[PDB]
Amino acid sequence: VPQTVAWSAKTGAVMVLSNILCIVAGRYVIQVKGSFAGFGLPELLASTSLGHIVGSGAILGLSYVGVL
Amino acid sequence: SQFIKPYNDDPFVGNLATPVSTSSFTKSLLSNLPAYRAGLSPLLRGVEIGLTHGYFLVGPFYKLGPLRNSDVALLSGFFSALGLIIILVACLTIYGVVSFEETEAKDQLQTAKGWRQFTSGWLVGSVGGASFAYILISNIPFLQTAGMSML
Amino acid sequence: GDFLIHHAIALALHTTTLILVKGALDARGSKLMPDKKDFGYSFPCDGPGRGGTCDISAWDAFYLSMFWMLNTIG
Amino acid sequence: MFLISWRGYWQELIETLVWAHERTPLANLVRWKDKPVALSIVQARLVGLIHFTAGYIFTYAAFVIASTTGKFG
Amino acid sequence: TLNLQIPSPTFEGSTGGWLRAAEVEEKYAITWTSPKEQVFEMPTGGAAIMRQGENLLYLARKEQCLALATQVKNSFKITDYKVYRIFPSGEVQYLHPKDGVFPEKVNAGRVGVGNVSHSIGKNLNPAQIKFTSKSFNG
Amino acid sequence: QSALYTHHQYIAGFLMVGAFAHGAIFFVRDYDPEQNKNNVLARILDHKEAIISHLSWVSLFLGFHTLGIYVHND
Amino acid sequence: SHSVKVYDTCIGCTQCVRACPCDVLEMVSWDGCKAGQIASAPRTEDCIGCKRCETACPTDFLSVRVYLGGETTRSMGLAY
Amino acid sequence: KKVSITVDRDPVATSFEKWAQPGHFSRTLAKGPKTTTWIWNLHADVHDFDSHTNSLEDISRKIFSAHFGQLSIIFLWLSGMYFHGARFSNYSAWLSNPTAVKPSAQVVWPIVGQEILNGDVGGGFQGVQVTSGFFQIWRASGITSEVELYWCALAGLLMSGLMIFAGWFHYHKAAPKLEWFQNAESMLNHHLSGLLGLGCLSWAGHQIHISLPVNKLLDAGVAPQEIPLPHEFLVNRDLMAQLYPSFSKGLVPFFTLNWSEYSDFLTFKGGLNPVTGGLWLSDTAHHHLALAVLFIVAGHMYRTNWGIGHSMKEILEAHKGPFTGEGHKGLYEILTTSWHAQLAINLAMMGSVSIIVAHHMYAMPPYPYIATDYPTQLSIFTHHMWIGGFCVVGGAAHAGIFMVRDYNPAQNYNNLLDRVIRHRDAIISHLNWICIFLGFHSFGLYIHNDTMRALGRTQDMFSDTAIQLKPVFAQWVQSIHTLAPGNTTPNALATASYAFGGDVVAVGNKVAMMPISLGTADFMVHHIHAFTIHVTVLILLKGVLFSRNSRLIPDKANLGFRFPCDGPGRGGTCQSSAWDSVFLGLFWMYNCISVVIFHFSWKMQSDVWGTVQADGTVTHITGGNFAQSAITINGWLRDFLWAQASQVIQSYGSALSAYGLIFLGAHFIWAFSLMFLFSGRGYWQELIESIVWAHNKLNVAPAIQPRALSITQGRAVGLAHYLLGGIGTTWAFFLARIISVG
Ligand code: CLA
Ligand code: CLA
Ligand code: CLA
Numbered sequence A: 001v002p003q004t005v006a007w008s009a010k011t012g013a014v015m016v017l018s019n020i021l022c023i024v025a026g027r028y029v030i031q032v033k034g035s036f037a038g039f040g041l042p043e044l045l046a047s048t049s050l051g052h053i054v055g056s057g058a059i060l061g062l063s064y065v066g067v068l
Numbered sequence B: 001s002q003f004i005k006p007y008n009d010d011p012f013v014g015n016l017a018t019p020v021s022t023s024s025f026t027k028s029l030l031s032n033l034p035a036y037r038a039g040l041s042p043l044l045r046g047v048e049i050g051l052t053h054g055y056f057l058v059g060p061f062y063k064l065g066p067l068r069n070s071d072v073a074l075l076s077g078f079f080s081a082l083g084l085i086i087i088l089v090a091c092l093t094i095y096g097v098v099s100f101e102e103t104e105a106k107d108q109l110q111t112a113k114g115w116r117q118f119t120s121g122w123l124v125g126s127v128g129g130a131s132f133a134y135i136l137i138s139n140i141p142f143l144q145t146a147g148m149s150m151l
Numbered sequence C: 001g002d003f004l005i006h007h008a009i010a011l012a013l014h015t016t017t018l019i020l021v022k023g024a025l026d027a028r029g030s031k032l033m034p035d036k037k038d039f040g041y042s043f044p045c046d047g048p049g050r051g052g053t054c055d056i057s058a059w060d061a062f063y064l065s066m067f068w069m070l071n072t073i074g
Numbered sequence D: 001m002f003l004i005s006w007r008g009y010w011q012e013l014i015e016t017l018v019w020a021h022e023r024t025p026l027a028n029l030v031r032w033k034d035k036p037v038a039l040s041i042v043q044a045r046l047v048g049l050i051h052f053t054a055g056y057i058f059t060y061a062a063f064v065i066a067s068t069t070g071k072f073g
Numbered sequence E: 001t002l003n004l005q006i007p008s009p010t011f012e013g014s015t016g017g018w019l020r021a022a023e024v025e026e027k028y029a030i031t032w033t034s035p036k037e038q039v040f041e042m043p044t045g046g047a048a049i050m051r052q053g054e055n056l057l058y059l060a061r062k063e064q065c066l067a068l069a070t071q072v073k074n075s076f077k078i079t080d081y082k083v084y085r086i087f088p089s090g091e092v093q094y095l096h097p098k099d100g101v102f103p104e105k106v107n108a109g110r111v112g113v114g115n116v117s118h119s120i121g122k123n124l125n126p127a128q129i130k131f132t133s134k135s136f137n138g
Numbered sequence F: 001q002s003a004l005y006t007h008h009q010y011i012a013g014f015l016m017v018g019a020f021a022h023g024a025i026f027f028v029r030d031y032d033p034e035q036n037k038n039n040v041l042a043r044i045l046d047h048k049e050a051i052i053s054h055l056s057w058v059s060l061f062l063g064f065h066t067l068g069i070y071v072h073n074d
Numbered sequence G: 001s002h003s004v005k006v007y008d009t010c011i012g013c014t015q016c017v018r019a020c021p022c023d024v025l026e027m028v029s030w031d032g033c034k035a036g037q038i039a040s041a042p043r044t045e046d047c048i049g050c051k052r053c054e055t056a057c058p059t060d061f062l063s064v065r066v067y068l069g070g071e072t073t074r075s076m077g078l079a080y
Numbered sequence H: 001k002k003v004s005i006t007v008d009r010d011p012v013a014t015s016f017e018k019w020a021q022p023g024h025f026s027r028t029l030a031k032g033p034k035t036t037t038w039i040w041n042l043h044a045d046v047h048d049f050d051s052h053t054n055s056l057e058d059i060s061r062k063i064f065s066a067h068f069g070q071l072s073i074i075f076l077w078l079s080g081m082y083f084h085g086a087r088f089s090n091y092s093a094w095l096s097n098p099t100a101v102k103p104s105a106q107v108v109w110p111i112v113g114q115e116i117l118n119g120d121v122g123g124g125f126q127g128v129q130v131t132s133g134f135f136q137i138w139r140a141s142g143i144t145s146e147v148e149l150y151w152c153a154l155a156g157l158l159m160s161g162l163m164i165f166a167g168w169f170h171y172h173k174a175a176p177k178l179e180w181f182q183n184a185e186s187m188l189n190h191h192l193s194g195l196l197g198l199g200c201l202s203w204a205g206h207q208i209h210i211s212l213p214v215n216k217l218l219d220a221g222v223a224p225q226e227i228p229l230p231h232e233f234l235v236n237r238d239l240m241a242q243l244y245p246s247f248s249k250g251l252v253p254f255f256t257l258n259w260s261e262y263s264d265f266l267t268f269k270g271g272l273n274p275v276t277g278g279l280w281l282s283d284t285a286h287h288h289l290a291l292a293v294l295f296i297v298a299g300h301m302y303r304t305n306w307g308i309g310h311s312m313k314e315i316l317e318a319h320k321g322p323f324t325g326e327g328h329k330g331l332y333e334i335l336t337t338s339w340h341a342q343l344a345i346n347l348a349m350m351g352s353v354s355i356i357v358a359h360h361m362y363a364m365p366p367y368p369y370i371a372t373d374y375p376t377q378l379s380i381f382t383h384h385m386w387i388g389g390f391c392v393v394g395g396a397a398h399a400g401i402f403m404v405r406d407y408n409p410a411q412n413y414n415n416l417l418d419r420v421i422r423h424r425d426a427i428i429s430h431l432n433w434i435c436i437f438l439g440f441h442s443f444g445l446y447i448h449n450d451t452m453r454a455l456g457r458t459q460d461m462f463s464d465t466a467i468q469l470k471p472v473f474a475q476w477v478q479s480i481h482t483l484a485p486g487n488t489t490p491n492a493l494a495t496a497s498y499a500f501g502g503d504v505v506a507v508g509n510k511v512a513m514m515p516i517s518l519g520t521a522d523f524m525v526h527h528i529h530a531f532t533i534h535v536t537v538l539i540l541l542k543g544v545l546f547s548r549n550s551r552l553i554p555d556k557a558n559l560g561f562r563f564p565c566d567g568p569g570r571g572g573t574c575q576s577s578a579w580d581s582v583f584l585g586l587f588w589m590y591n592c593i594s595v596v597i598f599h600f601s602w603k604m605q606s607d608v609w610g611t612v613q614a615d616g617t618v619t620h621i622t623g624g625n626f627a628q629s630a631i632t633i634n635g636w637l638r639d640f641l642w643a644q645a646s647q648v649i650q651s652y653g654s655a656l657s658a659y660g661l662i663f664l665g666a667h668f669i670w671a672f673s674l675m676f677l678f679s680g681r682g683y684w685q686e687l688i689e690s691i692v693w694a695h696n697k698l699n700v701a702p703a704i705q706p707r708a709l710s711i712t713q714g715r716a717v718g719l720a721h722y723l724l725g726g727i728g729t730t731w732a733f734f735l736a737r738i739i740s741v742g
């Protein structure tokens, strides 16, 4: 079984970083919707959902490979 | 940027100009085949085609025939290939008899004299190629076992 | 068993006779095709009109009765 | 197959085959003298009947001779 | 007469077109005039776009040309179409409409071919006309 | 004995089918009604419907009850 | 070529000519029916034998009749 | 908003008036019968909604409500299966002794001696042995009593009533508009995330919370009557945590991404459970949970009222290259306007999925005690193979129906469909050539081997003791998949299935699963399968591509999808429609699936299924005869067809005698089918003329004039009785053989 870790500040740091990267990426790449004008609740929900998805994937991969 | 075009700039003929059908490589290969190459008599077209096909005809008969596990496998395979060559020559002869009317033109394949020359060349080339394949397999042990002699 | 197989044989003989006699007597014409004698003994059909006329000739009745003859000798 | 499948399918297949032979290099040098067509309706009925009848006869003859030989001969 | 210089509808080509028998035995031509550029279905399979004005098309069979004529008649209200037969020697034989008037309309000068002066039930039995060149119609 | 019986019985089926087929050909090609006015052949043709209907009735009779007895026994 | 006959039971409804895919039939002047017209077959060399005209004919047993005969390139529907 | 709910209220009044007017849906049929043809036309075109009206909205509403009616029928069937399992089955005795009690959920009444069909199935019970596999499903679901089956039947009946009420409401009271049906993006989002995703999530919940503890107690040897009820497993966390200690940690490891703590009840063990011979249920629980996560993620892809999401029209129009012209442009309009194109795609996919289900379910038995239930395995493989083949041919048929009816060349200029039509001759010619090549170099091997064995030349045959055709690629794939645990799948304890290689998993001295070696005969029969599938593809694709026109018939689209011919002209144009191509492709599908199931039955009976005895040797049912006999047609005829039909023809006087009766009856009906298949309409119409004369003589002619069945109906009736006869013959033979010897 791949090793997973209990919740810590590193896990929070990766998850927060993944959320902030996904918010900026959703700000830049979404075609149909000063820089944060038009930023709505569905776009925030979609970006933060991708942030949780990316953070979960990154946390599991780094816990597998030992970076923790 | 379209890669598929109507054939011969005629959209209503039953063909399409494709990279498989009408590229430079395909046209060069077809125009350099003996059946289409310019400057050849029908006899020499027959000689080249017969040499190639009669040369490759020896192999399956030698390797898979009923006498393949006997000491006379190559002789039987060559004789069977020669019989197939004679049958195909008879097919060519009856095709040329029924397909063409007797004309003065003899430099084209689709004439009676030209097809008779092509059949003669195909027979002579087929016998020569089959005999060459027989010689090569008889004299090279690598061909007798088809590569297991290296192991 | 001999009783049953002879009555089966009678069935097959009567049915083959039905096909063959119906082919011979309707060869000159029927309600679906009253001018069949103008078309000969063997022809494919009379077209999809009038409901469809597949296997209407007496040659086709021969063709259908051949299977029943094979069944009877079988 | 000659008694179940009928003509137009096979005729269109033969149209496709005629196109294939006419458009294939090194084979369009050879030309048929008679145009390839599907068998006619009456001809196809007869050919299916012939294959059917030959199968019937050969199957039963082989069965009766080999069975009688195996049991008694 | 058939004008060979009439431009053709814009077609990308297909494998369904005419074979060697069109250039060797006989070929068919259909011309028609359209009020606008519009997409029609080819009778050999595929979509082509006909130009505004005159259109000339080549086929292998007369039935393909008449199918196209029926299609453009019932879908584009085009009735001025003309169908010709062309031989390898270059002789052009006008086919449809033969006298300029469509065959479903009566025109003067037409003569009846194949008309029989009795009902079909008055045809002869074969036994009268066996070993004899008399027709079954009488 | 098996080969001889099977052979000549299949020949018999072929011959009887050929007899009816060539009779149908006789109706198609050779039957003159005007030379056969009120003949026995003409009267076959005039009650052909009764003949075919009664052949159908006896065929359906035989098949219904023979198949019913066989399936019943099974 | 197939043979197409038109018998005098024709009522001149022009349905057989409209049903013909090969332009074999045409309507000519006649005095035997109320419509004043009868079908005719001047172009039976183009007849494929499809019998769409026979399907289209509304008179009890047909007025137009197609007899299949010698097969040609046109009658066999060969595009080759 | 763009995705919204639009409904018309009371569009059709609920009345019995049209119930008394057969043919009301069709203007041609509403005039009433004049011939017997009318009746057949009434029952043949009734649910062909697009031919009755041109309004797409009414057609879509009819389709939606007919789908509700089918769902109601399926729920009634499921409720019936649960009730008949509850009241007329030996399910508790099977739960106590799975390895010795034959499942049986049908009991006959004693009327005419048919009570002999209530065979001794064990457990003190008499009934008809069932092979649908419901007992193993209920054991996997944790159903330990018949009371739960009664409640399942009640739930099924309530859902059937709910579906039929929903059909009546959503047609007759509140019918959705055409704009509601034309939301592909919303339908895919809801059906991916809610139907498949939440369904997988809730079933993973049921598996984790109910199925795993009950099945763990069952495999440990506890009797079902002392096992705690499922709600006790829900509320008593200690009772669960004795069996799975990670439940003592609660949902904190889930939300903190410490998921490996849950590694005891969500596993990736693979292989099979040694006690039951089925898949580990923890593996299935992680599997369905992962499928739930993947489906819910996939269900947020498509654009909706809010700005996020993909537009499928833009995706389709963006994918275009130099070889393909306009590319995938115009397909979104086709699939959002034509129901027939969607039916084609979905039938094709459901058929392929059913075939995948059959393969993957024989090879990896997912249910406890289903692997050693050889009749259940054979029945579900054969059944889902047949359903898959039928659905694939139906996808081809309804593709042809789209091509004839809904295709518009003006909206399809130089797209992929137009270019496919424009090189149809190349496609059909190359496929025809490869089909002839496959036929020669596959079937001529069998003919050649038959001749060589008949000529007394065994060394000239294609066999493993003669000139070999070794399946090196499939053997290499098997070696990779056997080597996959720990090398390319490091977290797997065992292989995905033992059919690729490994140990002999046996349950109750019967082989659950063992390695399935592939030799010369497997090579030949897999290339026979490839040949048959390519020929079926040739028939169906040629029918679809030439549905609108051809060189023969330039106006085939005007005649329609379903016509008998275009007359005897052009040499003969018989069976020129796409419908007749479907008619022939159904025969070839029958041949293909028949050869597939014959290969399956023989290969499992000869090399996989059998009894394990002392010193670990496996005695197979037919003693390993597949390797030397399946290389000739004579070997198939004698060692498979002749040998294994002994059980169905000697079943008379036993409980399996009904299969023998059905065997004979299918033998009857199939032959009866040839009477329609070989004959033609004119003969039967003239015979009907004579019978009409007979009825006229007694003044008993009916007012509705009897006519022979149509040419298309003759073909369809012959095909239907042919398929029924062949499938019933294989059904009776397979079931009698596998019940008797397995
Ligand atoms: C910090 C970043 C990070 C790191 C280091 C990793 C690292 C890893 N991830 Mg991971 N991941 C990340 C971010 C990261 N991921 C993100 C952001 C997500 C999105 C949520 C994921 C989602 C994810 C999933 C869902 C999974 C992983 C898995 C894995 C491990 C796989 C090891 C391997 O050899 O692959 C395997 C390599 C293969 C080649 C296997 C083949 C995989 C399938 C079968 C191929 C299917 C191809 C398909 C047929 C299409 C091909 C056809 C084509 C021509 C179109 C690896 C340690 C896997 C895992 O946990 O395993 C224990 C796993 O299942 N990752
Ligand atoms: C997430 C919401 C959702 C769900 C679950 C479904 C589910 C379904 N739709 Mg669907 N649909 C949706 C939204 C949804 N739709 C939307 C938004 C649209 C408009 C764009 C459509 C338009 C649509 C059409 C046009 C059609 C369907 C059809 C179907 C059925 C497919 C057949 C099948 O597998 O049944 C088996 C699956 C089941 C789950 C069986 C149970 C059936 C009931 C209805 C499920 C109810 C679940 C309920 C909401 C939650 C209660 C569960 C629990 C809490 C007690 C299936 C029941 C087809 C059909 O058959 O219609 C009748 C069909 O033709 N849908
Ligand atoms: C008990 C089992 C059994 C069963 C299931 C059947 C079943 C059948 N029989 Mg049957 N039959 C049986 C026993 C059975 N038979 C016995 C024991 C006899 C000997 C008397 C017969 C004598 C018999 C005859 C003579 C006929 C049938 C027919 C039929 C079929 C149509 C039913 C019918 O009459 O239509 C319902 C009735 C009508 C539609 C119209 C009424 C016609 C009836 C038969 C006339 C009866 C009165 C008449 C004056 C007597 C003439 C008989 C004469 C020729 C000797 C049907 C499959 C008929 C058949 O196969 O058709 C080809 C038929 O003609 N059966």
Ligand code: CLA
Pocket (backbone or CB within 6 Å): C011, C015, C018, C019, C064, C065, C067, C068, F056, F057, F059, F060, F061, F062, F063, F064, F067, H668, H671, H672, H673, H674, H675, H678, H679, H687
């Ligand atoms: C096993 C195959 C089989 C069977 C049963 C039949 C049956 C029949 N054929 Mg036939 N035929 C066949 C193969 C078969 N054919 C083949 C392969 C050919 C070659 C093309 C022909 C060619 C042929 C011709 C040319 C003629 C017939 C005729 C007949 C009928 C009269 C003969 C007879 O026995 O009447 C008795 C009928 C039967 C035994 C049929 C079975 C009756 C069933 C068992 C009654 C019960 C039905 C059941 C209750 C339905 C419930 C189903 C529901 C639950 C869905 C009969 C309907 C002749 C005819 O119509 O004569 C009037 C005729 O002219 N057939």
Ligand code: CLA
Pocket (backbone or CB within 6 Å): H043, H044, H045, H046, H047, H048, H049, H343, H347, H390, H391, H393, H394, H395, H397, H398, H401, H561, H562, H579, H582, H586, H720, H724
């Ligand atoms: C998802 C499933 C599905 C759906 C919704 C449809 C829907 C439709 N199809 Mg389609 N089809 C399907 C699957 C489907 N089909 C499959 C799988 C095949 C391949 C076999 C076909 C083959 C097919 C053809 C060839 C044709 C259609 C046609 C039609 C249309 C009208 C059907 C009609 O009125 O029949 C009304 C209902 C019936 C006639 C009942 C049929 C009863 C069957 C034949 C017998 C069942 C036997 C039973 C199971 C066993 C009894 C044995 C027992 C007595 C011992 C309609 C749009 C027709 C059409 O006009 O399309 C435009 C058409 O020509 N389809």
Ligand code: CLA
Pocket (backbone or CB within 6 Å): D001, D004, D005, H432, H433, H435, H436, H437, H438, H439, H440, H443, H444, H447, H535, H538, H539, H584, H585, H587, H588
């Ligand atoms: C067992 C009977 C049988 C056989 C042998 C065939 C054979 C064939 N069918 Mg057919 N068919 C059959 C029954 C059969 N069908 C039935 C019952 C139906 C009912 C619906 C159909 C429906 C059907 C359709 C709808 C289609 C075919 C097609 C084909 C061809 C496929 C190409 C192929 O496999 O070439 C391989 C050839 C064989 C396997 C035949 C046996 C030859 C072997 C190799 C021995 C050769 C010996 C040698 C030539 C002898 C020389 C001796 C010398 C004296 C002459 C082929 C000619 C398809 C086609 O033509 O497209 C290509 C097609 O579209 N058939």
Ligand SMILES: CC1=CCCC(C)(C)[C@H]1/C=C/C(C)=C/C=C/C(C)=C/C=C/C=C(C)/C=C/C=C(C)/C=C/C1=C(C)CCCC1(C)C
Pocket (backbone or CB within 6 Å): B051, B052, B053, B055, B056, B127, B128, B129, B131, B132, B135
């Ligand atoms: C490999 C390659 C990889 C994959 C792709 C690929 C392109 C398909 C493939 C190429 C494949 C295939 C197509 C390979 C191409 C193959 C062919 C078969 C090669 C034939 C060579 C014939 C030569 C040796 C002989 C002439 C006889 C000599 C002159 C005669 C002496 C005689 C003359 C008359 C004078 C008297 C003495 C005698 C002895 C009687």
Ligand SMILES: CC1=C(C/C=C(\C)CCC[C@H](C)CCC[C@H](C)CCCC(C)C)C(=O)c2ccccc2C1=O
Pocket (backbone or CB within 6 Å): D001, D002, D003, D005, D006, D007, D008, D010, D011, D037, D038, D039, D040, D041, D044
């Ligand atoms: C398969 C099939 C074909 C295809 C058959 C092709 C066209 C003929 C193939 C036969 C080859 C060319 C020769 C076969 C040689 C025979 C073994 C012997 C012929 C020589 C003797 C008669 C002397 C049809 O043309 C057809 C037409 C109408 C209805 C059904 C069908 C049909 O089912």
Ligand SMILES: CC1=C(C/C=C(\C)CCC[C@H](C)CCC[C@H](C)CCCC(C)C)C(=O)c2ccccc2C1=O
Pocket (backbone or CB within 6 Å): H675, H676, H677, H679, H680, H681, H684, H707, H708, H709, H710, H711, H713, H714, H715
């Ligand atoms: C037998 C046969 C018929 C005759 C079938 C008749 C016309 C229809 C039979 C339907 C019956 C009436 C319904 C079911 C029969 C029941 C067993 C008893 C009848 C019950 C009555 C009260 C209706 C065809 O019309 C036909 C058409 C094209 C190719 C082949 C054939 C073909 O082989």
Ligand code: SF4
Pocket (backbone or CB within 6 Å): C044, C045, C046, C047, C048, C052, C053, C054, C055, D041, H564, H565, H566, H567, H568, H569, H572, H573, H574, H575, H680, H711
């Ligand atoms: S399907 Fe019937 S009516 Fe049509 S051409 Fe063939 S035999 Fe004639």
Ligand code: SF4
Pocket (backbone or CB within 6 Å): G004, G019, G020, G021, G022, G023, G024, G025, G046, G047, G048, G049, G050, G051, G052, G053, G054, G066, H569
């Ligand atoms: S058979 Fe066809 S082509 Fe000939 S006249 Fe009649 S409709 Fe015209």
Ligand code: SF4
Pocket (backbone or CB within 6 Å): G006, G009, G010, G011, G012, G013, G014, G015, G016, G017, G038, G039, G053, G056, G057, G058, G059, G063, G064
């Ligand atoms: S369809 Fe018949 S009635 Fe009408 S014009 Fe033609 S031949 Fe005369």
